């Protein structure tokens, strides 16, 4: 029973990456703080390219 994994910083990354790949071209389900919204959108734009490379 221990402490949270990668304290929303690069968990905010992979939430934006999974949400980037599975459609959701909103870019309008992020966090609201800056240090987590910045890389929710960072994972989103890193997921658009990984959508172009596949189907």
């Amino acid at each position: 029973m221990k402490r949270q994994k990668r304290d929303r910083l690069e968990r905010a990354h992979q939430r934006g990456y999974q949400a980037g790949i599975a459609g959701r071209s909103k870019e309008m389900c992020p966090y609201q703080t800056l240090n987590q919204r910045s890389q929710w959108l960072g994972g989103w734009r890193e997921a658009m390219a990984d959508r172009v490379v596949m189907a």
């Binding site: 990354h13 240090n35 919204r37 910045s38 890389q39 959108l41």
Partner: protein, 351 residues
């Protein structure tokens, strides 16, 4: 009566829209917010950074008077655009006098060309000029004592977009943006541009006579994704930017900003990358195959688990070094592409 009507047209007569009439008296100072009252609706939330002169500290106490600017009214609550631009008009007037004077004499000191014209700075502000303007002939101020004192003799100004190249040393010597968009083009012409609004993907620096630039989020720094441009640069500030791309159709000049501390990283690869220089550096997070010392201005991932001692595989760096400690580590490889320096720690005295 018509006292008030006359009073109204009087007060219309004794104000104007731009930052022209030095009228707002500074009626409260607190770091980091100045505030005036130029006879408008509310009081400006002034930054402190429109009012400190050339070395960082404030210059104006209570009662002091600078005009600001206008033509933008009510964003919810409040009144102005900043008085510092005010200042730009004064600079324009002096430049006009020189052009008007037939010449303008001040001091111009121009060390180097970001985009082909030495940079000249007058008083607080620094401006960029086209390459010829810095020197009257082929003299070149690179051999002159650094950041030398002359004046500026004007060589060239662009009259719409504000770029002015001025004449150092040699005292004796005396529709519209988009058709010919080939001036700042060719690959990397550096520009000095004020940023306007940072749209959480971008920064929107755009200065050169009615254009739009982005510098979006990917460059901006030497970290990619976690950056959030509001933290990293500014709001309303004239910066280092150059074109990197102009698209003729779609009208999207895509500028950049990483063309800076990229050089620092290169120096780190070199400076200490000449051979096998030793460095005193602090680890930040040990990730089961290394220790990740990251001292020396953003140089990223470093020492591997393979050296660490004179035993190869069994070591598990958390057992052997530390958390957050400055160590012996020397360079052993800088890879220019793919941004991997690979330091080591076995270079010590046990065998």
């Amino acid at each position: 009566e018509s006292f008030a009507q006359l009073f109204e047209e009087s007060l219309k007569e004794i104000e104007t829209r731009p930052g022209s009439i030095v009228r707002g008296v500074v009626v409260a100072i607190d770091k980091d917010v100045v505030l005036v009252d130029a006879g408008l609706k509310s009081e400006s939330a002034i930054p402190a950074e429109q009012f400190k002169n050339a070395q960082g500290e404030l210059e104006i106490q209570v009662g002091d008077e600078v005009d600001v600017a206008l033509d933008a009214v009510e964003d919810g609550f409040g009144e102005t655009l900043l008085s510092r631009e005010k200042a730009k008009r004064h600079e324009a007037w002096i430049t006009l006098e020189k052009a008007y004077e037939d010449a303008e004499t001040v001091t111009g000191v121009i060390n180097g060309k970001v985009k082909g014209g030495f940079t000249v700075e007058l008083n607080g502000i620094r401006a960029f000029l086209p390459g010829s303007l810095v020197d009257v002939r082929p003299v070149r101020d690179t051999l002159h004592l650094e950041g030398k004192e002359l004046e500026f003799k004007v060589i060239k100004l662009d009259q719409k977009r504000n770029n002015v190249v001025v004449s150092r040393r040699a005292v004796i010597e005396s529709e519209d943006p988009w058709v010919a968009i080939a001036k700042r083009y060719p690959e990397g012409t550096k520009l000095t541009g004020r940023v306007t609004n940072l749209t959480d993907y971008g920064c929107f620096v755009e200065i050169e006579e009615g254009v739009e630039g982005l510098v979006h989020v990917s460059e901006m720094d030497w970290t990619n994704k976690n950056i959030h441009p509001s933290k990293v640069v500014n709001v309303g500030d004239v910066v280092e930017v150059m074109v990197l791309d102009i698209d003729e159709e779609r009208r999207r000049i895509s500028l950049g900003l990483k063309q800076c501390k990229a050089n620092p990283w290169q120096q780190f690869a070199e400076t200490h990358n000449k051979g096998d220089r030793v460095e005193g550096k602090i680890k930040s997070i040990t990730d089961f195959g290394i220790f990740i010392g990251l001292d020396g201005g953003i140089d990223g991932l470093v020492h591997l688990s393979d050296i660490s001692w004179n035993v190869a595989g069994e070591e598990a760096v958390r057992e052997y070094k530390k958390g957050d400690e400055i160590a012996a580590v020397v360079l052993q490889v800088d890879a220019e592409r793919e941004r991997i320096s690979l330091g080591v720690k076995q270079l010590a005295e046990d065998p």
